[PDB]
């Protein structure tokens, strides 16, 4: 089996992505996060808080025939972010794009942060790293990928997402007419969950190449890209009147500046993030003070290739017994 679902930015900013799920029986149709650094398929719901929904698409399991109360089991779970949700836990039939599983743990929402309840356009998140960091308790659930994986053509997920454009999410095979050139593949390490991967180096606009280790995970539910200070700094210096500005929470560049682009290696590859990509606008309406899309990772603890750098490519997901990355162009 395959599918293949669109997803699209929830605002002119590309501040994250939604995709249609289908949940229940009926059908009911979610827009939810997929998020490849974390583990759980959560919904707001029918149980959900009253007055911490503003706006969402709520699933209902009350509605849905092939429902089932999964006894005793609940969730909570923490994102590095500084949100967070929690609740109970449903099983029931889940598709995306044409890809249907039954049995899916759908996470029920009785409680969640400002940030969610703020953000209208989400209604909920389908994680896609690995199942050892599901929050289920206390029968640990696996993802919606992972319960595909046996039936799909090949093992794999792909991210192709847009700049200020849908894009596309696809699980089983690999779409040979989405990218340019040849994908590069490199090992992952899954010893802490995510889709870790050494990125080999970086560039600033059309400076050389530095050969360097970075050490880095490829989070599709987080928006910006976070790397070491170091690299960071470099990018910025070349940015006239761009500054870490703590009071902010990150660097800002005048938005009257043209930004260079940012290259990272993949193996002897590169991928080049133009320079728009790294412009999230302005601090606040009508400031000319602008947010920057390369921040630094220090204190967060682990370098985030997120969406900043992940649209510029066609990423592989390969969920194969020894998993790997891919990354092309295009």
Same mark, same amino acid.
């Given at each position: ?12 900013? /590309? ?141 794999? +997920? ?12 696809? +699980? ?32 600033? $606009? ?9 050490? $880095? ?53 590169? @991928?080049?993030?133009?320079? /728009?990509? @790294? ?14 899309? @390369? ?21 592989? +997901? ?13």
């Amino acid at each position: 089996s395959t599918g293949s679902a669109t997803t699209t930015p929830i605002d002119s900013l /590309d501040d994250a992505y939604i995709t249609p799920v289908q949940i229940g029986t009926p059908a009911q149709t979610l827009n939810l996060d997929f998020d490849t650094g974390s583990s759980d398929l959560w919904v707001f719901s029918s149980e959900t808080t009253a007055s911490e929904v503003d706006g969402q698409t709520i699933y209902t399991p009350s509605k849905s025939t092939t429902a089932k109360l999964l006894s005793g089991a609940t969730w909570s779970i923490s994102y590095g972010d500084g949100s967070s949700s929690s609740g109970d836990v449903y099983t029931d039939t889940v598709s995306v794009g044409g890809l249907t599983v039954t049995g899916q743990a759908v996470e029920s929402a009785k409680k969640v942060s400002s940030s969610f309840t703020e953000d209208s356009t989400i209604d909920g998140l389908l994680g896609l790293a690995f199942s050892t960091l599901n929050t289920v308790s206390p029968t640990q659930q696996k993802t919606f990928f992972d319960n595909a994986k046996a039936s799909l053509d090949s093992p794999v +997920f792909t991210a192709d997402l847009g700049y200020h454009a849908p894009g596309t999410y696809n +699980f089983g095979f690999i779409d040979t007419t989405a990218y340019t050139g040849s994908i590069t593949y490199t090992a992952v390490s899954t010893k802490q969950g995510f889709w870790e991967w050494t990125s080999t180096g970086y560039a600033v $606009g059309s400076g050389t190449f530095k050969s360097t280790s970075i050490d $880095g995970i490829a989070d599709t539910g987080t928006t910006l890209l976070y790397l070491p200070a170091t690299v960071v700094s470099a990018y910025w210096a070349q940015v006239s009147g761009a500054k870490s500005s703590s009071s902010v929470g990150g660097y800002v560049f005048p938005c009257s500046a043209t930004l260079p682009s940012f290259t990272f290696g993949v193996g002897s590859a590169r @991928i080049v993030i133009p320079g /728009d990509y @790294i412009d999230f606008g302005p601090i606040s309406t009508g400031s000319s003070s602008c947010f920057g899309g @390369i921040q630094s990772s220090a204190g967060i603890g682990i370098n985030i290739f997120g969406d900043v750098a992940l649209k510029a490519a066609f990423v592989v +997901f390969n969920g194969a017994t020894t998993p790997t990355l891919g990354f092309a162009s295009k």
